[PDB]
């Protein structure tokens, strides 16, 4: 695959990771309560 | 153990994936260019 | 509450382990180049 | 260079890999709290 290819992949993981972090952090915040 | 010590782990994982979302972010970029 | 935390945490180790498998499959791809 | 990115790529997968082993490890923790 051409490296555009491979960069549109790699901000679609990106976006993914940053909204599981986000889910993390929200339990975290539940369990430190 | 104590559960903060539960949520301090589930704070450090969801900094680790903050983190990758901004290193995969920049690769990005990079291949983009 | 706990019971639910863990399925959620759950959900994400799921979550991120099928982008880890992506994320190798990329790599791969890259470094055949 | 292609090379670095790759490897970079597959160090990222890593550290995913080992975030899902560790929330499945911390589920399994909260389960039997
Ligand atoms: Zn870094
Ligand atoms: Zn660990």
Not at 13 to 31: D, F, G, I, T
Request: proline share 0%; net charge positive.
């Amino acid at each position: 695959m051409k490296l555009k290819q491979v960069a549109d992949k790699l901000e679609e993981v990106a976006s993914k990771l940053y909204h599981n972090a986000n889910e993390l952090a929200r339990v975290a915040k539940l369990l430190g309560e």
